[PDB]
Enzyme design. Structure first.
Site, short mmCIF file in Angstrom:
data_model
loop_
_atom_site.label_atom_id
_atom_site.label_comp_id
_atom_site.label_asym_id
_atom_site.label_seq_id
_atom_site.Cartn_x
_atom_site.Cartn_y
_atom_site.Cartn_z
CB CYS A 126 -1.03 -0.18 1.12
SG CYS A 126 -2.00 -1.69 0.98
CG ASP A 175 -5.39 -1.39 -6.19
OD1 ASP A 175 -6.07 -0.51 -5.66
OD2 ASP A 175 -4.26 -1.74 -5.78
CG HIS A 207 -5.06 -1.52 -2.29
ND1 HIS A 207 -4.12 -1.03 -3.18
CD2 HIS A 207 -4.79 -0.95 -1.09
CE1 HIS A 207 -3.32 -0.19 -2.53
NE2 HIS A 207 -3.70 -0.15 -1.26
#
Lengths: 239, 233
Positions: A126, A175, A207
């Site tokens: 991330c 994502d 994600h």
């Protein structure tokens, strides 16, 4: 066994900055060092677990705390922490990375006999994937492998032209935060500057699919797959 | 390695079969580039056999090869444009042949495990035949195939896919790879896409020094063997 490993909290000062984080150490297989950078939640148990997993594979793994001891369990708090890090405190974070590297080198952590030199990698998830790219470019003489997982390219300027390490960039096909068009642009920059980057895009996952503590996004099959690929890549470039 | 030549269900099958140490094991069909079934492809089959797979380099050009792009383009256009039904029949007859000879049968799972891989034109074929014969394959590994040559029915694909692409591929724009990812997303295809920056089409081909990239060829081989082992053993 050869896979034996322990972990310990570090906290110290160097070159005017406070360093803290979690160091996982192999007992017998004292290999290269991997710096592991947390998500926007901060240095939470999941990230320390990842460090432990690296240590079982024969790597020193340092989960650096970039949030000065703070964690978040909700997006509002996490967003505030991340914006502060990447906005206000980026130069401080850079100094923490640099001081960390100097610390490990002075302690001969990451020294590899085969090449008679240090071998340090970096990985993160991330926000930590963004940081892996960014710090990888900023400290291009220090890193021998980069493995950013689903980082954003639009938050801070990544100097692709400066990257010297090989890169394994992991992306999620669905994502919500990183459109495929952004990944394409990153590929094109790597093409342009001759960056040795391989982009691995897993269809159908979101994600943070590696995060086994988040059942809403975790994908077991691809998490197991990508771990295999990442370990092989770190062994190839760091041993 | 054995040069196979026989007839089944009205079509002539030929190709190169590389055999591992044991009498039983998983099968990989390996599909050539637009040059045809040339020594490089037979070498790839041998490499698979050293990793414990039966590997069949099927000839889709009925014994013809090309060493120049004009001839190779003509052969490929004829295969994909005029003879595609015949190629399908050859794939199907090949699968039936191997199954009847217990090649591809994996003791551990008491069932057939057949994969398919190919390069260039052969990558296109891997996607195409993977969609056409979706009950037959347990793993697909297309290398730098074109998506615009033949219709790929992504909705039909049931095998896991490892799709390898070159970042600077002159024949396969990144926009086409993007579109393939989006189709895989849409239809639930378990596809992983691996895009290597800085390299051209055919970077795996060690006989082509103008495009071969040793570092990525070594890397992708490792990933492909691990993927085939994961899904076929």
């Amino acid at each position: 066994h050869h896979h034996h490993h322990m972990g310990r909290e570090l906290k110290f000062k160097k070159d005017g900055v406070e360093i803290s984080g979690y160091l996982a150490e192999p007992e017998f297989t004292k290999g290269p060092l991997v710096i592991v950078i947390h998500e926007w939640w901060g240095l939470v148990p999941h990230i320390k677990d990842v460090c432990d997993r690296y240590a079982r594979e024969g790597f020193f793994a340092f989960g650096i705390d970039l949030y000065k001891g703070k964690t978040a369990d909700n997006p509002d708090d996490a967003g505030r922490l991340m914006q502060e890090l990447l906005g206000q405190r980026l130069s401080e974070a850079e100094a923490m990375i640099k001081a960390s590297l100097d610390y490990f080198k002075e302690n001969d952590i990451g020294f590899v006999g085969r090449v008679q030199d240090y071998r340090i990698g970096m990985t993160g998830f991330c926000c930590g994937g963004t940081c892996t790219w960014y710090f990888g470019a900023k400290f291009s003489d220090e890193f021998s492998a980069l493995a950013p997982y689903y980082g954003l390219y639009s938050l801070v300027p990544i100097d692709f032209s400066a990257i010297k390490a090989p890169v394994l960039a992991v992306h999620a096909g669905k994502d919500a935060f990183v459109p495929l068009s952004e990944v394409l642009k990153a590929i094109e920059e790597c093409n342009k500057y001759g960056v040795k980057a391989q982009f691995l895009i897993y269809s159908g996952v979101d994600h943070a699919f590696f995060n086994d503590t988040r059942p809403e996004v975790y994908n077991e099959e691809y998490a197991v797959d990508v771990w295999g690929k990442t370990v092989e890549f770190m062994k190839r470039h760091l041993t």
